[PDB]
């Protein structure tokens, strides 16, 4: 299973002159290129070691694509002010997500192309890559305009062609870096507490990718309501961390078991205190 994404953003701010445009590319959810208009010599920069294979002709072209998108966002931002009857002197955001999903047969599984204004969904290309979805009354002007121009055919071509073909190319070029999954190393810690109770905190550390599930069991059935957890969080080194806890009678603690479900594991982990 594989994917590519470009996550594009432009933000305007009161008083300033031109919006700031940032684009970020991801292969299999890991960052691999970046462009940022604030930089001294704005360019698409490599963002993993495996991308340094790519020659000068590659960066030059990608860089001109970015400058083009910058101009596209500029104008779009301007039109949006108009559509929403927003005056001057505020801050606005326009974001885009696009890319493609491949199954393990390396064939195109799904295409994505969606837009948000002020962090709210504005318009998106449906799964069929032929029809558009736009909720806001203000978005209808765009959707009619786009329906009558064959915008969807343009995007369809990209998503079915270059997206796929170039993801293919990238995947071959970085086999040793992007085929890894680090398994979690788990453990349970003991925190004494009020009223003859204790907190059992189940840790999972050094794992990649980030998706993971931790469940507590009272000798069999799970405990959904009484549980406490944290949002999965980066360690800073490329791996991730997460815990989940439940409150338990002192002494009567061994009939609680913690289960860790991660990808990259031979089978779910099972731990107690």
């Amino acid at each position: 299973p594989h994917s590519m994404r470009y996550f594009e953003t432009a933000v305007s701010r009161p008083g300033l002159e031109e919006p700031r445009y940032i684009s970020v590319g991801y292969v299999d959810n890991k960052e691999f290129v970046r462009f940022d208009s604030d930089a001294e010599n704005p360019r698409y920069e490599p963002r993993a070691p495996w991308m340094e294979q790519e020659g000068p002709e590659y960066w030059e072209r990608e860089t001109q694509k970015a400058k083009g998108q910058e101009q596209w966002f500029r104008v779009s931002l301007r039109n949006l002010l108009g559509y929403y009857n927003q005056s001057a002197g505020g801050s606005h955001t326009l974001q885009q997500m696009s890319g493609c999903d491949l199954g393990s047969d390396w064939r195109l599984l799904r295409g994505y192309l969606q837009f948000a204004y002020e962090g709210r969904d504005y318009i998106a290309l449906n799964e069929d890559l032929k029809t558009w979805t736009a909720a806001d009354m203000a978005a209808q002007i765009t959707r009619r305009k786009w329906e009558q121009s064959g915008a969807a055919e343009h995007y369809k071509a990209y998503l079915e062609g270059e997206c796929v073909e170039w993801l293919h190319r990238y995947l071959k070029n970085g086999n040793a870096t992007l085929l890894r999954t680090d398994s979690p190393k788990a453990h349970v810690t003991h925190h004494p507490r009020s009223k003859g109770e204790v907190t059992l905190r189940c840790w999972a550390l050094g794992f990649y990718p980030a998706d993971i599930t931790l469940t507590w069991q009272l000798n069999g059935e799970e405990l959904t309501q009484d549980m406490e957890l944290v949002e999965t969080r980066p360690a800073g080194d490329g791996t991730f961390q997460k815990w989940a806890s439940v409150v338990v009678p002192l002494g009567k603690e061994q009939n609680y078991t913690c289960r860790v479900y991660h990808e990259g594991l031979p089978e779910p982990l099972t731990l107690r205190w």
Partner: peptide, 9 residues
């Protein structure tokens, strides 16, 4: 490979 957009919003 970066997408390039069609018509502005």
């Amino acid at each position: 490979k970066a997408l390039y957009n069609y018509a502005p919003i």
